[PDB]
Design a protein around this ligand. Structure first.
Ligand SMILES: O=C(O)c1cc(F)c2nc(N3[C@@H]4CC[C@H]3C[C@@H](OCc3c(-c5ccccc5OC(F)(F)F)noc3C3CC3)C4)sc2c1
Lengths: 225, 11
């Protein structure tokens, strides 16, 4: 419904495909030896790159540049882990460039504990059967980044004033493309709680990695402390 | 203190 949603939606869809991952980074999932060392480095590169495309994508979300500035950093630092999941989920499920079956092994031998690899791909498979469209991936990303519930937020109501419209547009989209089962909107929103569970375990993977001398880029260090 | 995040939010 409404035309004003289209002015808000497609402009978000403008930003969601403005930048893909550079070919200079994706092609080494193929070209280079499958070492536990180089596996981690490639993943570091892509994670490094993805923080950049997210900051640009969020910088355009309507009303983001108007928020307080000590809170936008808390928005980014609290959502970067989860938004990287959505994009890599869209890659694994659509099987796009991402080199799915080869990227997954490079992930499976990067020093990650087995108790974190199992629930990770169970998520990947589960969110694949949802047969989600690109606009659903794009909005869910916007809603995750603009989460008023994040840690060290001061003006929590300000975030709600910009997350609320995008939530209504999305449920008004499970109106058109699926009128058969009204629960699809509640099924996409479950994923955002799934991602929160992962954000808990991700802090553990990080400390396990640097225990073992895994240097990150300066920017991942800043966004994960 | 959020040196690099603030730089990309202003580029
Ligand atoms: O636009 C495209 O075409 C495109 C193609 C891709 F192929 C692709 N791939 C992506 N991504 C995201 C999340 C998994 C996959 C690889 C990166 O994550 C690496 C990572 C994570 C990580 C963070 C969140 C989720 C999974 C993660 O990796 C993990 F190993 F599974 F844990 N933590 O540390 C790290 C590296 C060591 C420092 C960024 S985005 C992306 C975009």
């Amino acid at each position: 419904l409404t035309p004003d949603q289209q002015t808000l939606l497609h402009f978000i869809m403008d930003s969601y495909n403005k930048q893909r991952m550079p070919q200079e980074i994706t092609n080494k999932i193929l070209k280079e030896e499958f070492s536990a060392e180089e596996n981690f480095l490639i993943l570091t590169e892509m994670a490094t790159n993805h923080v950049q495309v997210l900051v640009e994508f969020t910088k355009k979300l309507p009303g983001f540049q108007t928020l307080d500035h000590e809170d936008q950093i808390a928005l980014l630092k609290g959502s970067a882990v989860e938004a990287m999941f959505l994009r890599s989920a869209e890659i694994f499920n659509k099987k796009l460039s991402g080199h799915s079956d080869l990227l997954e092994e490079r992930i499976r031998n990067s020093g990650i504990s087995d108790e974190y690899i199992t629930p990770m791909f169970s998520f990947y498979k589960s969110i694949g059967e949802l047969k989600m469209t690109q606009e659903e991936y794009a909005l869910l990303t916007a809603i995750v980044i603009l989460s008023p519930d994040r840690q060290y937020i001061k003006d929590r109501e300000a975030v709600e004033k910009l997350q609320e419209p995008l939530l209504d547009v999305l449920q008004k989209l499970c109106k058109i493309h699926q009128p058969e089962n009204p629960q699809h909107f509640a099924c996409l929103l479950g994923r955002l709680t799934e991602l929160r569970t992962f954000n808990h375990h991700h802090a553990e993977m990080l400390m396990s990695w640097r225990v073992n001398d895994h240097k990150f880029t300066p920017l991942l260090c800043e966004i994960w402390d | 203190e959020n040196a690099l995040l603030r730089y990309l939010l202003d580029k």
